């Protein structure tokens, strides 16, 4: 969009989000981290 309205917008809901998977996500590197 050549004329998108730039910047960070106000007018959003600033109150965490009680609609998310509360379970452990079994999709992460299970290996030791060499860093």
């Amino acid at each position, epitope marked *: 969009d050549p004329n998108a309205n730039p910047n960070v917008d106000p007018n959003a809901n600033p109150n965490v989000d009680p609609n998310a998977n509360p379970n452990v996500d079994p999709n992460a590197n299970p*290996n*030791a981290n*060499p*860093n």
Partner: antibody
Amino acid sequence: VQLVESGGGVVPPGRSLRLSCATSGFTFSNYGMHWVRQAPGKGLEWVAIIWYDGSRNFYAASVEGRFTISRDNSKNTLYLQMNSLRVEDTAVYYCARAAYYDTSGYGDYWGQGTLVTVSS
Amino acid sequence: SVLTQPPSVSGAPGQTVTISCTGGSSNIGAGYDVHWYQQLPGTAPKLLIYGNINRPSGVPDRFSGSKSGTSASLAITGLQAEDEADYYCQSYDRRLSGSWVFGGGTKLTVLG
């Protein structure tokens, strides 16, 4: 800070060889160490890391299971034991002192290097 | 080799020569800090740049660099004959088991 490689030379493939570095000028027991190598005419390749207390070790995929890294804090000495040396393991091996910056790490002090040649 | 460097760069003494290092989403665009090493013809690599912009007190203020997106770069100004060397970039690739990864190195030739 001195790091001094020793134990290079030439062996037939299939033989074992043991390299080491003596260090001085810093407290050896407070730092982790790295080994890297450079095949003649090639760039640098990371080989292995050992944690300051010896608790963790990581190896490059191309050497894991053949190489062992170890250290003796009371002797200020870092060792690398290579088993089943292959022709492809010909390289100059170097010691480096581990350092860490923020999201990634780096070596700050380096040794001089020593040459290991594998050939029949 | 997961970081790409040009094999060779050059310039006349006094000119500014830059050496690029291009990675991808797993290493540079991933936020891992980029480091640079300098190797002279018969010795061990020396840390030149660390932390993308910082340098050891033993490095002339002729060397500097930057990081942006998946790109990184080393700029050498006031090129001297003594800068003939191999320069390497280093970072961390989250897809690999090793702590460090290196580019193939770039040789800087000073056209004396």
